[PDB]
Paper text:
Csa3 family transcription factors are ancillary CRISPR-associated proteins composed of N-terminal CARF domains and C-terminal winged helix-turn-helix domains. The activity of Csa3 transcription factors is thought to be controlled by cyclic oligoadenyate (cOA) second messengers produced by type III CRISPR-Cas surveillance complexes. Here we show that Saccharolobus solfataricus Csa3a recognizes cyclic tetra-adenylate (cA4) and that Csa3a lacks self-regulating “ring nuclease” activity present in some other CARF domain proteins.
To elucidate the molecular basis for cA4 recognition by Csa3a and any conformational changes induced by cA4 binding, we co-crystallized Csa3a with cA4 and determined the structure by X-ray crystallography. Consistent with this crystal form, the asymmetric unit contains a single Csa3a homodimer, and the overall structure is largely similar to the cA4 free structure. The β1α1 and β5β6 loops project above the floor of the cA4 binding site in an alternating pattern about the dimer axis, where they successively interdigitate between each of the four adenosine moieties. Notably, a crystal contact with a neighboring asymmetric unit results in a cation-π interaction between Arg200 and the solvent-exposed adenine ring of the fourth nucleotide. Local to the cA4 binding site, the most prominent conformational changes are modest movements of the β1α1 and β2α2 loops as they move away from the dimer axis, expanding the conserved pocket to accommodate cA4. This small rotation of the α3 helix is, in turn, transmitted to the C-terminal helix of the wHTH domain, acting as a pivot point for an approximate 7° rotation of the wHTH domain relative to the CARF domain.
Numbering used by the authors:
A (entry chain B): 1 to 123, 126 to 159, 163 to 173, 177 to 191, 196 to 212
B (entry chain A): 1 to 212
RNA sequence: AAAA
């Protein structure tokens, strides 16, 4: 079970693609935030989405309208919605107004809930990230960790154990949860490259 | 001197509006990131921009072209550009590809640099929100139980002078001043009026709402 | 790539 949290523009097909790609189920939650007032294009897109959801056995959408006047007053409404969504929260920034997508994006990050955000090339190519990515980039690494990463960066991958001079691993599984390295040779991933780049 | 970091689509109007609303100077770094390869509508918007920039003594744009294969690979390239921009970084995410603007936004936050982001209304309207680095750091800060006790009081009294706050919290005014100065750095409270009553602003309300 |  999961939650979809998106805004809606004039084209419901972006959301239909997201719902099928991630195998949406009826038990899931679908929450659509739209600007106030609801313009004709957005309303038509919602009715078009209702008819197509009712055929495909998807979850019924809940629609929230919010005025977009102040960054904090609008974030306040986005946050109240977010605390009512069970994790993980699936989001896609390719559709709807940029202002509202910005508030959704910032809303899930500061809420510290689990999430997966997708962003597409126009509506073919696609990139994604999650709460683990953001937390791995926002983390203040200690020097025991930082100089271990810098060694892995310079050695490119127990030969490691006789460099920092320790025993022979509990920290390895801890850093594998942050997705910054893998594991035989301990291999640093691209996310770890960004880690080191942020703290050099 | 400031710096501007934006991406470009087919329309330069929002960038020229940004430059006009923030009083852009010729000594500023204007940096534009575009996808690779540069398509013809983006080449045309960039030529339309340079003509108007020269006539208004705006900064000349330095243009970088980025490939976007993977999230981490593309962010890596955005960070290289960000980490050579002088602070503060002024950005406007209402233009160009959404993928690039997401990386620009995410790149700026994690670079811990100073910034102001604008996001406008596509339909041309006057609706516009903005935020800055203190905004994000405020919402993500780990607030101690003691710090939360102080914020909870300002919400229930709606403004209280330093002397009464020190009484309500069983602390010295000397130590309350230092703590109020530290919270003021994050932008979550202000102290206006001739009575110097400490008050929670809208940002402080969101901070309190996150810890319930 | 201005509710794509």
């Amino acid at each position: 079970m999961k939650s979809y949290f998106v805004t809606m523009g004039f084209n419901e097909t972006f959301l239909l693609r997201l719902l099928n790609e991630t195998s949406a189920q009826k038990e899931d939650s679908l929450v659509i935030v739209v600007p106030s007032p609801i313009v004709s294009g957005t309303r038509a897109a919602i009715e078009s989405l209702r008819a197509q959801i009712s055929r495909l056995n998807y979850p019924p959408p809940r629609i929230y309208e919010i005025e977009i006047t102040d960054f904090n007053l609008a974030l306040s409404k986005i946050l109240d919605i977010i605390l009512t969504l069970p994790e993980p929260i699936i989001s896609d920034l390719t559709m709807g107004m940029r202002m509202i997508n910005t508030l959704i994006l910032l809303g899930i990050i500061v809420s510290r809930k689990r999430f997966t955000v997708y962003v597409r090339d126009e509506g073919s190519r696609v990139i994604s990230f999650n709460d683990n990515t953001i937390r791995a980039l926002m983390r203040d690494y200690s020097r025991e960790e930082m100089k271990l990463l810098n060694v892995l960066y310079e050695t490119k991958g127990t030969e490691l154990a006789k460099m920092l001079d320790k025993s022979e691993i509990n920290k390895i599984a801890e850093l594998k949860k942050f997705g910054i390295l893998t594991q035989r040779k301990v291999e640093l991933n691209e996310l770890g490259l960004n880690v080191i780049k942020l703290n050099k």
